[PDB]
Amino acid sequence: SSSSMILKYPYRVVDTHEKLKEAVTSLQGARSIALDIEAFCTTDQAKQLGRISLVQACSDAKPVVFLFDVLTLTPDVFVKDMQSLLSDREIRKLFFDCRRDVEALSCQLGVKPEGVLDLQVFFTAIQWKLRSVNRRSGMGYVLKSVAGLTRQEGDSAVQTAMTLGNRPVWDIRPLPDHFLEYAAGDVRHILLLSNYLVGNKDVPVDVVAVERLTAQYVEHYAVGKPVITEADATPAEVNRAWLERYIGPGGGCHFCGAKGHTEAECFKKQNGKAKCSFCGEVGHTARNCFKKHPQLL
Ligand SMILES: O=c1ccn([C@@H]2O[C@H](COP(=O)(O)O)[C@@H](O)[C@H]2O)c(=O)[nH]1
Ligand SMILES: [Mn+2]
Ligand SMILES: [Mn+2]
Ligand SMILES: [Zn+2]
Ligand SMILES: [Zn+2]
Numbered sequence: 001s002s003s004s005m006i007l008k009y010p011y012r013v014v015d016t017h018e019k020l021k022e023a024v025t026s027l028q029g030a031r032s033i034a035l036d037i038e039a040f041c042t043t044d045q046a047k048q049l050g051r052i053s054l055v056q057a058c059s060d061a062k063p064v065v066f067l068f069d070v071l072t073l074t075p076d077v078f079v080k081d082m083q084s085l086l087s088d089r090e091i092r093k094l095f096f097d098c099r100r101d102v103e104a105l106s107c108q109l110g111v112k113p114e115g116v117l118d119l120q121v122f123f124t125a126i127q128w129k130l131r132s133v134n135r136r137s138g139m140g141y142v143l144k145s146v147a148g149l150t151r152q153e154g155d156s157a158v159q160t161a162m163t164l165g166n167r168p169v170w171d172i173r174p175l176p177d178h179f180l181e182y183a184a185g186d187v188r189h190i191l192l193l194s195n196y197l198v199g200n201k202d203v204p205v206d207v208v209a210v211e212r213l214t215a216q217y218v219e220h221y222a223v224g225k226p227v228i229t230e231a232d233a234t235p236a237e238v239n240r241a242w243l244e245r246y247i248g249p250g251g252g253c254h255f256c257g258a259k260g261h262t263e264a265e266c267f268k269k270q271n272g273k274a275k276c277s278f279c280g281e282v283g284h285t286a287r288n289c290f291k292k293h294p295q296l297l
Contacts, residue, residue, distance in 0.1 A: 030059035040168035053170035132250030
């Protein structure tokens with residue numbers, strides 16, 4: 001439905017003060033805003049993101065993806081007109097793994113967003129409530145599991161340069177079209193995921209619970225300085241004590257009792273179903289098969 005139109009939103013480069021005011025007015029009338037950051041690649045390959053180059057934004061108020069050129073605009077100009085927007089708790093800010101992004105917004109821009117919802121944490125919260133799984137999943141896994149969508153391939157020229165790590169990559173101006181298109185991809189996927197995860201009676205976790213859980217991550221990573229102690233035991237998981245407090249106890253399989261999978265995924269329940277040895281059907285045994293014993297039918 002409306003999820004199909006999200007991925008065909010075109011990008012608008014915002015690199016002037018007039019384009020910045022036109023974008024702020026549009027984002028002001030929004031209810032949710034998907035956010036992402038493209039930063040300079042760091043030779044140290046350390047935790048903290050590099051110098052912010054682009055901030056990507058995609059809201060439900062307009063069919064467009066704003067690419068704020070923070071490098072050209074300078075952080076000071078970009079912050080002066082985006083601060084209250086990011087500080088407005090009445091507008092939901094959507095992220096996929098907000099940790100290093102919130103750290104960069106705090107360290108480099110001096111802003112701490114309000115009303116944040118981390119859709120990667122949202123997915124892990126579902127995995128925790130159903131399977132007692134606290135691992136974090138990548139964007140593609142979440143897109144396939146939640147929306148049944150296989151995202152298109154990222155441009156390998158941009159992907160190799162970023163994995164290579166010799167250069168800032170995102171310092172060049174103007175940016176090629178395949179860099180601009182690469183940068184606008186994540187915010188489209190993020191806003192799409194919110195339609196499947198927010199306002200859904202089939203989602204077993206309340207949004208307010210994941211909002212409270214995300215606010216803890218923001219408080220931990222928006223401290224106006226580089227974060228040293230990570231909130232999670234490993235980078236690819238979610239703090240279990242935070243899951244127990246905000247989401248509740250972890251779940252498991254109602255059939256066999258084991259954690260890590262649900263009843264629909266249980267091998268033992270599937271292997272234990274009666275399978276007719278005479279006609280192959282699942283559901284009955286040979287002693288009750290009408291095909292083998294027509295005296296029953
Ligand atoms: O009855 C089972 C047991 C495991 N798994 C799946 O196997 C993987 C590893 O689970 P485990 O070996 O840690 O039990 C997970 O994807 C889990 O969902 C099932 O689908 N059903
Ligand atoms: Mn990101
Ligand atoms: Mn991104
Ligand atoms: Zn089971
Ligand atoms: Zn049979």
